[PDB]
């Protein structure tokens, strides 16, 4: 690289791109890497703290690599540190790593691993790609058939393209950075839609509004489409579940984030005596956290007693039988905010 013999200064001339670092507490993605990748090994995650950290692992930035153009688009949008796990050993390493929240397919088939590791208990959310082909409003319900109906997944359709990238960029890798950029500036409870992409991105296929109405309904495919005043922007917040409970990705990612923070407060109660002075410390630790989250506007309620409730007790939640087994049962409820998705203007010709 550079060899330094005299103290001096050095006025080397080279074109290397440098991206500014960001720290994200809530979004740590795991990029699925294909086999025939000679840089990372099987069965260990390589933590990449920054774009410079990634640019030391590989020698040159490669335009032809699907992994290279996906990682550069991730760090240009504001992503923090991420892990790089190969896709065949992917189901063994994600349970080892504690603080992993996102699971990102950078143009990879992770549909086998997402069914077996995305459970209601585990905190993994899994954003992956739409189909690379230009689809139709006509054969539209067959493209939604290819994806599973899990509530933990979101599909973003158009593979983005850039002037620096030779190949088209998978859209899930830019959305791991948009998730980290939204939650840092406005919070996890805010939806990641109508946010502009900071990198030099634009969609490969311009999407009509009538086509987006087909895909938004049943197994919803969010779409990245260009607006003349905003540039390119994300235009969906819906998961793959059509049920009214987990329809939107800000509600699903809020519940994933809250239960991870409650996991850390219940870590200190581990292996403490199972009696009442522990339970009133478990309840007080959760009640502080949900109150300060409600004060940030994360939970929807005018009255503080409407936003959440916590219930521990020997009469209430756990039996005398279950206490002797070693169990401790808490009930938490939350009231998330839903995003306004449609705005209907009525224009009247007479003013009255």
């Amino acid at each position: 690289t550079t060899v330094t013999s005299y103290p001096g200064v050095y006025i080397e001339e080279l074109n290397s791109l440098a991206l500014s670092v960001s720290n994200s507490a809530t979004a740590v993605p795991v990029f699925a890497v294909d086999e025939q990748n000679q840089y990372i090994s099987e069965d260990n995650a390589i933590r990449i703290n920054s774009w410079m950290d990634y640019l030391n692992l590989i020698g040159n930035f490669n335009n032809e690599d699907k992994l290279d153009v996906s990682v550069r688009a991730y760090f240009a949008n504001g992503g923090g540190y991420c892990y790089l796990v190969k896709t065949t050993s992917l189901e063994k390493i994600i349970p080892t790593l504690d603080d992993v929240t996102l699971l990102v397919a950078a143009g990879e088939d992770i549909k086998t691993t997402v069914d077996v590791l995305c459970q209601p208990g585990k905190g993994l959310f899994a954003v992956f790609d739409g189909p690379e082909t230009e689809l139709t409003i006509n054969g539209a319900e067959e493209a939604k058939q290819a994806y599973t109906a899990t509530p933990f997944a979101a599909v973003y359709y158009p593979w983005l393209k850039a002037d620096w990238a030779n190949i088209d960029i998978p859209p899930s890798a830019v959305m791991a950075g948009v998730y980290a950029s939204v939650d840092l500036s406005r919070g996890v409870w805010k939806a990641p839609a109508n946010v502009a992409l900071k990198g030099g991105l634009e969609p490969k296929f311009l999407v009509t509004d009538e086509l987006q109405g087909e895909y938004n309904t049943g197994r919803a495919i969010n779409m990245i489409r260009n607006f003349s005043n905003t540039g390119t922007t994300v235009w969906g917040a819906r998961t793959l579940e059509d049920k009214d409970n987990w329809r939107y990705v800000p509600v699903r990612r809020l519940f994933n984030s809250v239960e991870r923070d409650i996991k850390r407060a219940m870590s200190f109660a581990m292996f403490e005596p199972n009696n009442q002075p522990t339970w009133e410390r478990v309840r007080a630790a959760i009640s502080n956290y949900l109150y300060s989250l409600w004060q940030q506007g994360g939970l929807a309620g005018s009255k503080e007693e409407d936003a959440y409730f916590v219930q521990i007790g020997k009469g209430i939640t756990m039996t005398q039988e279950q206490i002797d087994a070693g169990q401790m049962i808490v009930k938490v409820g939350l009231a998330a905010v839903r995003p306004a998705e449609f705005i209907i203007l009525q224009f009247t010709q007479d003013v009255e």
């Binding site: 720290n23 407060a265 630790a285 502080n288 956290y289």
Partner: protein, 148 residues
């Protein structure tokens, strides 16, 4: 239960810990004042009713640095003493809010082409319990504020 790394991201920055660096030197200062941007406003108004307001000509930046008198050192005075007719050495001043025992900057202001006017001598006073302090005043241009 706020973690100590959450306070580094969410909490406001206290003013009292700062580093001032005048040119190549860095010298400890008691207080820094002024150092603000300003703009004149241009207003056009015609007869049909529309009223145009515009940002106009920028204003000159005037900074006041305050410092106590130390027994061996007069290098605020030697800067203002070197003024021959219009020739003075202008140098860049950087203020920087830091942490305790500053190895890490939190905010940074940068001043360009600052030169001294009006060095103020201490007010000697037989019935006062104070330190001899001096204010130097700087005229400059282009205050910019840098994150970290």
């Amino acid at each position: 239960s706020t973690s100590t790394s959450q306070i580094a991201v969410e909490y406001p920055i206290p003013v009292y810990r700062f580093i001032v660096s005048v040119g190549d030197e860095k010298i400890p200062f008691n207080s820094v004042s002024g150092l603000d941007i300003s703009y004149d406003t241009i207003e056009y108004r015609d007869g049909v009713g529309n009223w145009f307001k515009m940002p106009g000509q920028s204003q000159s930046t005037n900074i006041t640095l305050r410092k106590g008198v130390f027994p061996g050192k007069t290098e605020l005075f030697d800067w203002i003493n070197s003024i021959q007719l219009n020739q003075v050495e202008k140098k860049d001043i950087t203020i920087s809010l830091t942490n305790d025992a500053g190895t890490e900057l939190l905010m940074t202001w940068n001043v360009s082409n600052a030169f001294p006017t009006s060095l103020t001598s201490p007010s000697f006073d037989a019935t006062s319990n104070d330190i001899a302090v001096q204010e130097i005043t700087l005229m400059a241009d282009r205050v910019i504020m840098q994150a970290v």
